[PDB]
């Protein structure tokens, strides 16, 4: 499609300030302010009443938004949002202001949660799709991210390779940013991920983050859930969403990692919903 090519960067042959870090590796707590138009697929899940940031999400077409199922449904915490409870805000930079003439707000038509989403035990298959009431118009600030194909997942989803997470979540586990934050994090070896937690991890998840010894740090935090973990393909220079911010024990704790929904493993379900609805 035209996915993954940003109007203000790729289209104009301009690079953002940290994309080099990702490409050099190919072979939000402790993040920084995003540049304008740096993540044009970033979406804010916003509750109508009370008005509050619920979660992040991503734009994958003119009508479809991808997020974590737990952002909508999590029985242990009596959470169960329906279409009429939520609004999606697209094209934003500022966390709190209504960005007149820039952002677009949409109502939801339908919410689809993975039928085998495991909220009882380990958040396995933490994924959901949301169909917009009306198609959103693309712009310099609004543009869809690509979904990975088998070949892209295979070559990019490797330990040590860095991906990028963005969101308007808290800056510390223990305030909130004024603008969208960004942080680049390395994918971690599955054994290391398993050995960091008592939670049973599945092939539908992967973890990322720096190991205690690596010196650098960073993580998603409250308000970042549902947001995109993206990587930039060195082959075609497009941005692909490899993961969804799913769960993590605290934020940026030494010895703990962030866990992400594995988008490609659940791609078949994604195609079914869209092809069917």
């Amino acid at each position: 499609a035209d996915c993954g090519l940003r109007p203000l960067f790729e289209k104009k042959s301009l690079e953002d300030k940290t994309e080099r870090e990702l490409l050099e590796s190919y072979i939000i707590v402790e993040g920084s302010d995003a540049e304008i138009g740096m993540s044009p697929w970033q979406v804010m899940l916003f509750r109508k009443s009370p008005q509050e940031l619920l979660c992040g999400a991503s734009l994958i077409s003119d009508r479809w938004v991808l997020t974590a199922a737990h952002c909508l449904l999590y029985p242990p915490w009596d959470k169960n949002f329906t279409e009429n409870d939520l609004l999606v805000r697209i094209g934003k930079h500022s966390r709190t202001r209504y960005e007149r003439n820039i952002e677009k707000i949409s109502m939801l038509e339908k919410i689809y949660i993975h039928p085998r989403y495991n909220w009882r035990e380990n958040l396995d298959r933490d994924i959901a799709l949301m169909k917009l009431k009306k198609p959103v118009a693309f712009s310099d600030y609004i543009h869809p991210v690509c979904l990975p194909d088998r070949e892209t997942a295979a070559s990019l989803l490797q330990a040590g390779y860095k991906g990028r997470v963005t969101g308007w979540g808290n800056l510390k586990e223990t305030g909130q940013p004024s603008v969208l934050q960004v942080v680049n994090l390395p994918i971690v070896e599955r054994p290391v991920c398993k050995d960091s937690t008592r939670i049973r991890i599945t092939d539908n998840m992967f973890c990322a983050g720096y190991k205690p010894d690596e010196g650098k740090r960073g993580d998603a935090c409250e308000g970042d859930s549902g947001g995109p973990f993206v990587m930039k393909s060195p082959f075609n220079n497009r941005w692909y969403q490899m993961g969804i911010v799913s769960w993590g024990e605290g934020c940026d704790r030494d010895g703990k990692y962030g866990f992400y929904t594995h988008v490609f493993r659940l791609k078949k379900w994604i195609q079914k919903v869209i092809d069917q609805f």
Binding site: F46, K48, S49, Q51, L53, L87, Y98, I105
Partner: peptide, 9 residues
């Protein structure tokens, strides 16, 4: 949060 346009709430 800044109030959003009434045509949504």
């Amino acid at each position: 949060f800044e109030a959003i346009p009434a045509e949504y709430l």
